[PDB]
Design a protein around this nucleic acid. Structure first.
Ligand SMILES: [Mg+2]
Ligand SMILES: [Mg+2]
Ligand SMILES: [Mg+2]
Ligand SMILES: [Mg+2]
Ligand SMILES: [Mg+2]
Ligand SMILES: [Mg+2]
Ligand SMILES: [Mg+2]
Ligand SMILES: [Mg+2]
Ligand SMILES: [Mg+2]
Ligand SMILES: [Mg+2]
Ligand SMILES: [Mg+2]
Ligand SMILES: [Mg+2]
Ligand SMILES: [Mg+2]
Ligand SMILES: [Mg+2]
Ligand SMILES: [Mg+2]
Ligand SMILES: [Mg+2]
Ligand SMILES: [Mg+2]
Ligand SMILES: [Mg+2]
Ligand SMILES: [Mg+2]
Ligand SMILES: [Mg+2]
Ligand SMILES: [Mg+2]
Ligand SMILES: [Mg+2]
Ligand SMILES: [Mg+2]
Ligand SMILES: [Mg+2]
Ligand SMILES: [Mg+2]
Ligand SMILES: [Mg+2]
Ligand SMILES: [Mg+2]
Ligand SMILES: [Mg+2]
Ligand SMILES: [Mg+2]
Ligand SMILES: [Mg+2]
Ligand SMILES: [Mg+2]
Ligand SMILES: [Mg+2]
Ligand SMILES: [Mg+2]
Ligand SMILES: [Mg+2]
Ligand SMILES: [Mg+2]
Ligand SMILES: [Mg+2]
Lengths: 394, 153
RNA sequence: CGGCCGGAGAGGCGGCCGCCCCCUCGCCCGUCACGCACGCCGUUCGUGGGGAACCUGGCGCUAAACCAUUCGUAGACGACC
RNA sequence: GAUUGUUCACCCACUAAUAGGGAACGUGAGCUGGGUUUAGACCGUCGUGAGACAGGUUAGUUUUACCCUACUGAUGAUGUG
RNA sequence: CAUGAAUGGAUGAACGAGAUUCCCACUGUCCCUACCUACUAUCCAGCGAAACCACAGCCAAGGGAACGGGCUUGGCGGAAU
RNA sequence: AGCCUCUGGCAUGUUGGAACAAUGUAGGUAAGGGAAGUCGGCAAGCCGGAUCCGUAACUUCGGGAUAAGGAUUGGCUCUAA
RNA sequence: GGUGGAGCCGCCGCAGGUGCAGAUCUUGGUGGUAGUAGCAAAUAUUCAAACGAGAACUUUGAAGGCCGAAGUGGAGAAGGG
RNA sequence: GCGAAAGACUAAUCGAACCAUCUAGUAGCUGGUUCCCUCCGAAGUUUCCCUCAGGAUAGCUGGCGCUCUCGCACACGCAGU
RNA sequence: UACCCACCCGACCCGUCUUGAAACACGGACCAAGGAGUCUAACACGUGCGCGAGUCGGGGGCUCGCACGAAAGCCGCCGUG
RNA sequence: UAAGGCUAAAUACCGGCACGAGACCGAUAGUCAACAAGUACCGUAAGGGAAAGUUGAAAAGAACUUUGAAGAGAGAGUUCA
């Protein structure tokens, strides 16, 4: 017979080889279509989720109840030190797919970049890229990497740039840099290419990839939660109190005549640590790490013009569970996938964004920096000694 | 008595057997084939780490329900355990044979465990008591272990 | 034997130039010869085949992986960072 | 949602709409056990009687998965020196 | 249909682990689930059963003892767990 | 009564070690709503001791009755009896 | 051919308790399941020493604990021997 | 027997104990029924039966024969025509 | 021919009751040993043999302690029947 | 010739004592019992009631050396084995 009272299904099938993700750094599965008229730029970046906080801003969407009112928005902060370019890679279009031509790494490489090459490091001799680097000064310093750029100029169509993070500038215990191919959505290969030939061994800060109030996509790995019941995983109903054998299950799996349990029935399994691609997140502010000209420009982190304190986005006691953010960052509206410290990939929008809620230029009026290690009550440490004042420990 | 697979050179080969020992034949067979073909001193160490849980014994034939482990990767398996009694019992027998080769006049440090074999033994009887007054047989499974070390170097 | 090309769709191939030494070979004719094995079968080649083990010379080489340990961003164990 | 063991029914209320059905009249080693449908009892009718009654009524044990498969997750696997 | 007088009729204080209905109080019964604890399960050393078993174990449709795992035709199939 | 302790008696009731997954079995707690839950308020929680007050219908005049409904309650220093 | 260590068969006649796959057959034996289910009711153990081939489990000391006098304490009946 | 009555209880047994025997009780009803080869080869219909899951009798079957015929230049007989 | 392997074609698991079984009908994990138309009496027909209007056979008797014998042989008994 | 009485022989013997034999069974057979069998064991009791034969010819039943806490081994020896 049929279902008495119809109801939607629990949880989308559009996600459902719901397994522990096979990668860790968020892999970009599609880069934006390269319009070959606009100048050359990078399409992706690589940041680290740090924490969250309150924002205060004025709204401009006329006709709404909250036009010219102040709202609070929760924002993540993605600590994003400048990435380093090490190599370029060519791709050529085939019927069978999109094959890779020619990877050409620079003369130097790094130290952090070597880490990403061997599982155990301190046991090894650190020999990676020790004879490829030899090519970059001799007669063959023209054969294998000057006829190659001419080859990648003749037959290549799409050119990405292999670029690794700097793991030494972060508070993290990791030192294995994160490499990633970041496609160059410029125009005219050989201009797409005689730009990355230049930026070999070079820094790339976040203000080159991304601009303020730009719709990007965040590509990371869900927070992990282990084996979970059908009730947590697929968010089913709980059976009534009286059920003899468990009440956190699905009473009926399937019907008798399809003698297999179906692909789409809810089951217990791993939950969390899936790969997800969040789209259409907005940037509220591109940051700038506390650099030195005389000393410690911590001011230029959370000092919006409307309050002009000298806060760093670091709250009191740093961002709980992760540390203090000390270089550039991007402030994102709402929540991003992943836990603290997770490697986050930041892609530019594949959509032509022309809505009213987007394109909305943003003015920060106050950035909350009170401690997240409990119920913080007051923002900066000097303000603490404006209240209570002289403590006993003096 | 005779063994199966009597040795190539009866001159440079010592033997040792045990009959009716209280180990579990499905474990002592797994730990007997893992040590098979090794060189004596390499195996004495291996059988001590089986006790200290530093190297496993990969469970190939009798693997039902046996859990995965990390040290199983060396043998190219997934399942492996640390059968401690099984290690201790073919450790005496690996130590008895090391003396039979001493008395025969051989080179102790060039002996390679070439043949080794574990057979089921006449089972023991106990009884467990089960619901509704049933009485099941709660039996043991002993074994006859026997091994032949050769001089191969 | 050296150099310059051309070819990328999974290229795997050619092409085009210098120099050394050597040979004179497709077609008609003469001229003889070549175990003529005594009527008999798997003949004739792509074959320096493909793969697996071992005896000469020249140039180069100089590891990582897994365990043990540690970490949790991960966990039923495995696995993973 | 109210009533009902109910399927079915009827109403209240909301809504964009409160369409109709199949999957062993989907689905008890998934549940519940209200209804049927044991043994206890109670009435009415019938039967001389034991008893009968799709006539009511109240009380009445709901087992076993470790096997193969499917499915969900989890290690791996031959190849690629 | 088919009540009714010791096959007892009508009442009824107290009493009832007797059967219903309603209201107040209360509440994770529910909207809608969440987390915390103990013992498990989980992995390990030790010790070790049983029911069950033709052969066995991926599907669609067809026919067929009129609902196949095996047969026909398709779909497909990768060790050990 | 329960709860803690002397006298006396044991060594966690046929094992240990490592972890804190899902389901469980026992215990707990939940914002707002409060029986909309279900066949039914199933289970659970509300009440709870004492002192002071206060007490209905009904009645076989014994009861109902701890009806219902309210208040008070520690420590200390006194006083009175 | 082998192992085995004391008896055995061919033909003509006679006599049978005379030929097994099966009977939820009888008795005995052995697998797959499986090194799996399991060794989870009453809060609890730890340190040092002794003994010893060998100690989480014995013994002594120390510490923490429970039974809490309607006992896990001290004595008897029936029963046991 | 015993029952403040449920057919309750009477040594894990009760709408009628346990033990041995009569006993290999009876079964128109299930289950099984042991070597080869060769030749022949059915029935599910008739009448009667407390007959309708069985028998009795008819048929259909086989075995055993016998009486003759004459392919022994020299045949009457029969027939799903 | 029989051991292993390869291939092309064929090929559903046996026993059973059944109009119909590979059956989503039942018995069957596996292997050993055991295991089911017997004897007696009474008829009936067929067949072999002795004698033949007769022919026995029993019970008795006469001959052994048996070795073979509790046999064989013999008896107006032989016809009482 | 009743109402009173005695009696050897041929006749019967799955108990008992003592024997003899067999076209019998041969250790799941033959008695339940080839053995410490009506024993072990079950049941309150009446009763029920098993399994279990074979070293060699002679114990000549493995001294001694060695490894091990020991069980077990390695050599040696006994033997026709
Ligand atoms: Mg519908
Ligand atoms: Mg229940
Ligand atoms: Mg916080
Ligand atoms: Mg038990
Ligand atoms: Mg009992
Ligand atoms: Mg149904
Ligand atoms: Mg079901
Ligand atoms: Mg059920
Ligand atoms: Mg009911
Ligand atoms: Mg009833
Ligand atoms: Mg009446
Ligand atoms: Mg009447
Ligand atoms: Mg398990
Ligand atoms: Mg405990
Ligand atoms: Mg005890
Ligand atoms: Mg609440
Ligand atoms: Mg309700
Ligand atoms: Mg409802
Ligand atoms: Mg209750
Ligand atoms: Mg009242
Ligand atoms: Mg003999
Ligand atoms: Mg016989
Ligand atoms: Mg037989
Ligand atoms: Mg207590
Ligand atoms: Mg005492
Ligand atoms: Mg029948
Ligand atoms: Mg039928
Ligand atoms: Mg069928
Ligand atoms: Mg039947
Ligand atoms: Mg007289
Ligand atoms: Mg016997
Ligand atoms: Mg025998
Ligand atoms: Mg016997
Ligand atoms: Mg024997
Ligand atoms: Mg024997
Ligand atoms: Mg012999």
């Amino acid at each position: 017979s049929h279902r008495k009272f119809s109801a939607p299904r629990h949880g989308s099938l559009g996600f459902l080889p719901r397994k522990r993700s096979s990668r860790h750094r968020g892999k970009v599965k599609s880069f934006p279509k390269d319009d070959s008229s606009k100048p050359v730029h990078l399409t992706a970046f690589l940041g680290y989720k740090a924490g969250m906080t309150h924002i205060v801003r004025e709204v401009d969407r006329p006709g709404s109840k909250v036009n010219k009112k102040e709202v609070v928005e929760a924002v993540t902060i993605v600590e994003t030190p400048p990435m380093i370019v090490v190599g370029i890679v060519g791709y050529v279009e085939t019927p069978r797919g999109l094959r890779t031509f020619k990877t050409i790494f620079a003369e130097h490489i790094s130290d952090e970049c070597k880490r990403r090459f061997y599982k155990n490091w301190h046991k090894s001799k650190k020999k990676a890229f020790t004879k490829y680097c030899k090519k970059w000064q001799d007669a063959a310093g023209a054969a294998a990497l000057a006829a190659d750029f001419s080859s990648m100029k003749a037959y290549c169509q799409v050119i990405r740039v292999i670029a690794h993070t700097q793991m030494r500038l972060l508070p993290l215990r990791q030192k294995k840099a994160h490499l990633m191919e970041i496609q160059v959505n410029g125009g005219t290969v050989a201009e797409k290419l005689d730009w990355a030939r230049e930026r070999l061994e070079q820094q790339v800060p976040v203000n080159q990839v991304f601009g303020q109030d730009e719709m990007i996509d965040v590509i990371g790995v869900t927070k992990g939660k282990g084996y979970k019941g059908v009730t947590s995983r697929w968010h089913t109903k709980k059976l009534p109190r009286k059920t003899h054998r468990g009440l956190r299950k699905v009473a009926c799996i399937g019907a008798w005549h399809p003698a297999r349990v179906a692909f789409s029935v809810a089951r217990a399994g791993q939950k969390g640590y899936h790969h997800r691609t969040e789209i259409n997140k907005k940037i509220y502010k591109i940051g700038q790490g506390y650099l030195i000209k005389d000393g410690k420009l911590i001011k230029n982190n959370a000092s919006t013009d409307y309050d002009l304190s000298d806060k760093s986005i670091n709250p009191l006691g740093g961002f709980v569970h992760y540390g203090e953010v000390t270089n550039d960052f991007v402030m994102l509206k709402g929540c991003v996938v992943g836990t603290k410290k997770r490697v986050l990939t930041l892609r530019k929008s594949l959509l032509v964004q022309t809505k009213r809620r987007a394109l909305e230029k943003i003015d920060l009026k106050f950035i909350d920096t009170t401690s997240k290690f409990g119920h913080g009550r007051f923002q900066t440490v000097e303000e603490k000694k404006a209240f209570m004042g002289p403590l006993k420990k003096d | 008595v005779r063994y199966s697979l009597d040795p190539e050179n009866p001159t440079k080969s010592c033997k040792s057997r045990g009959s009716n020992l209280r180990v579990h034949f499905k474990n002592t067979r797994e730990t007997a084939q893992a040590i098979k073909g090794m060189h004596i001193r390499k195996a004495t160490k291996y059988l001590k780490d089986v006790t200290l849980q530093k190297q496993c014994v990969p469970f190939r034939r009798y693997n039902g329900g046996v859990g995965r482990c990390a040290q199983a990767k060396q043998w190219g398996w997934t399942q492996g355990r640390w059968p401690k009694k099984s290690a201790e019992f073919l450790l005496h027998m690996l130590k008895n044979a090391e003396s039979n080769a001493e008395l025969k006049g051989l080179d102790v440090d060039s002996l390679v465990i070439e043949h080794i074999q574990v057979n089921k033994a006449p089972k023991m009887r106990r009884r467990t008591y089960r619901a509704h007054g049933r009485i099941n047989p709660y039996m043991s499974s002993p074994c006859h272990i026997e091994m032949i070390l050769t001089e191969k170097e």
